[PDB]
Design a protein around this ligand. Structure first.
Ligand SMILES: [Zn+2]
Ligand SMILES: [Zn+2]
Lengths: 367, 367
């Protein structure tokens, strides 16, 4: 396989289905990436993550650089070997979690662990190298929501300067440039002209893929969709489009309708341990008393191992009791659900019936 | 298969190896039973528990009757169906956890949930029926350690009265009597004559197996072994001998040397989630800094899936980070370790080299 190849096999309106080929394997698009925070997809063995259909996982650079540490992971053979996942890994740059969980300047950011630490385009790319990441995210500056036009512009500008620095850091490391891919991130808040300026700048630098950054931050789905409506067509058509941190099933469906090829989100894992299970008739909270003697599976059609073997009543009990197996089963189911969602999307695009799928999906999910 | 058949295939001194055949499957003896507290072996799917080599698990009646409730489990199809374990299950009577976790009389005990509840020989046996238990423990009275001779005697007497009541409750329920087995429990603290009186009384009532109750309560291994020395030969030779709540590896080895065929204990599960891993060179606490860059498996010889795929360094990280996968891997390893211990014991008895095994095991484990 090549370092990186993205091919589109089929289209319907703005939606695309296809594949990204990388050395560690093929990624089917549109793709959903389970989140590995600190070198683990919570409550699942890597074999289980794969069994659900995941082709790629995400790793959180901020968490890894704190614990167990980037240099340490490299000493130990890199993230894939350390955690037992041998397929592609996308790493974020660490910058988001800096702002939400942890001194800012043109050089980068210093911060204290939730221990003093530093990140910058250079160090970020370096850390992702040390981890052995297959898909490297450029380091950008977070743009809060809402942001004024002035501040959105200043920050987008900085982020494009940081994108160039990311590109150069990445390219100067031969091992990294030969074996990994680099994605740039579009900024500009909700403003069309800034989104265009950002797209243009990223395209001129040139990346293997392009993320739409800065959304799912409080603006709500209508605004997110309106921004996607004009922002995604600005990106190069022949490269992957990644919508960072977007994961409700209806968000995913609408985002694919607007040209997005890749997603990540902690909802299936997070929501799973907390009691929320996804179903084709909408989410359920398994802790509800209504499930205490319900012998049905979490979902009536789901092909996952959990739905083949255990009842709502049992999982209800486990989660009420705070048992680890409850978290394990809920998580496996929810990630499997998401992968079946992605498969149905891929198939429907390939068959030119994605519009009808989106309709059918919503009528039932929000019934 | 029959309701219950115990056959001894080989002997060495007081040690025995053989099999218990029951409707739900064969149990290899000497046997170690992973503890399913509230209808789950903590952090493991039943398929994983089986993969480690377990033939039978234990269920805690006290916990189940509190949550999710005995009647509820019966409504739902019984414990095996509810939790996804289709091999034999031994249930305790609930009485121990009453005294350690929750009004006492000749009738039984009432207590408040850690909701007011009640247990007695009759209700205990009934609850174990509702759960669908394959091996039913008679309901007895706990004898604290230390106990005076007078109190040890009074309580042992009560427990033998309760043993008769257990036997009669069990036999009066045709479904239970035809499909399950009933074990009696020997009491008498550390006193030989009371242990003899108890053995005699149990044998006269007649049970499918006989537990040595009242040990591993603070007396320490030397005293436990001294009591086993005279107490186990008092039990019928042709039925299983169960030592309740005994689980350190050296305790198990010495107990088998004295005639015990069955064990349960929460150490491998409990100790696992807390960081303790069993090895043939002795336990280790994986949280220790010494393991942060150790690429070796938990144990150099262990055949378990954990030791084939992950390093000490990774598990170290997971447990330090409070990740659920750390608990999963530690537990799978420790239960697998215990099952390999039981296998080595079985094989060595079958080959007439158990004495040498016990020697070799100790010299290395306590090196
Ligand atoms: Zn499912
Ligand atoms: Zn192992």
């Amino acid at each position: 396989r090549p370092r990186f190849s993205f091919s589109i096999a089929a289209r319907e309106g703005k939606a695309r289905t296809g594949t990204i080929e990388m050395k560690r394997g093929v990624i089917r698009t549109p793709a959903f990436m389970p989140v590995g925070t600190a070198a683990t997809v919570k409550a699942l063995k890597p074999e289980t993550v794969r069994a659900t259909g995941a082709d790629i996982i995400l790793g959180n650079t901020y968490h890894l650089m704190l614990r167990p540490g980037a240099e340490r992971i490299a000493k130990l053979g890199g993230l894939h070997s350390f955690m037992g996942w041998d397929r592609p890994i996308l790493t974020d740059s660490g910058g988001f979690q800096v702002m939400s969980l942890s001194k800012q300047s043109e050089e980068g950011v210093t911060f204290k662990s939730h221990s003093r630490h530093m990140l910058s385009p250079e160090r970020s790319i370096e850390i992702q190298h040390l981890l052995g990441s297959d898909i490297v995210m450029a380091f950008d500056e977070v743009t809060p929501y809402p942001a004024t036009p002035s501040r959105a512009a200043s920050s987008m500008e900085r982020s494009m300067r940081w994108a160039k620095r990311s590109r150069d850091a990445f390219d100067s490391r031969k091992e990294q440039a030969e074996n990994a891919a680099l994605f740039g991130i579009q900024q500009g808040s909700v403003f069309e002209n800034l989104r265009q300026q950002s797209a243009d700048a990223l395209a001129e630098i040139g990346f293997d893929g392009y993320a739409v950054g800065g959304l799912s931050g409080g603006e709500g789905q209508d605004e997110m969709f309106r921004v996607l409506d004009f922002s995604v067509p600005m990106l190069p058509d022949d490269k992957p489009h990644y919508l960072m941190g977007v994961g409700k099933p209806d968000d995913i469906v609408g985002a694919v309708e607007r040209g997005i090829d890749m997603f990540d989100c902690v909802l299936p894992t997070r929501s799973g341990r907390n009691g929320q299970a996804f179903t084709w008739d909408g989410p359920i909270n398994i802790r509800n008393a209504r499930f205490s003697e319900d012998l049905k599976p979490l979902d009536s059609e789901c092909h996952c191992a959990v739905c083949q073997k255990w009842s709502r009543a049992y999982i209800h009990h486990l989660i009420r009791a705070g048992e680890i197996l409850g978290a394990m089963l809920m998580t496996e189911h929810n990630i499997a659900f998401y992968q079946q969602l992605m498969q149905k999307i891929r198939d429907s695009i390939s068959e030119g019936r994605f519009s009808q799928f989106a309709q059918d999906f919503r009528a039932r999910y929000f019934a």
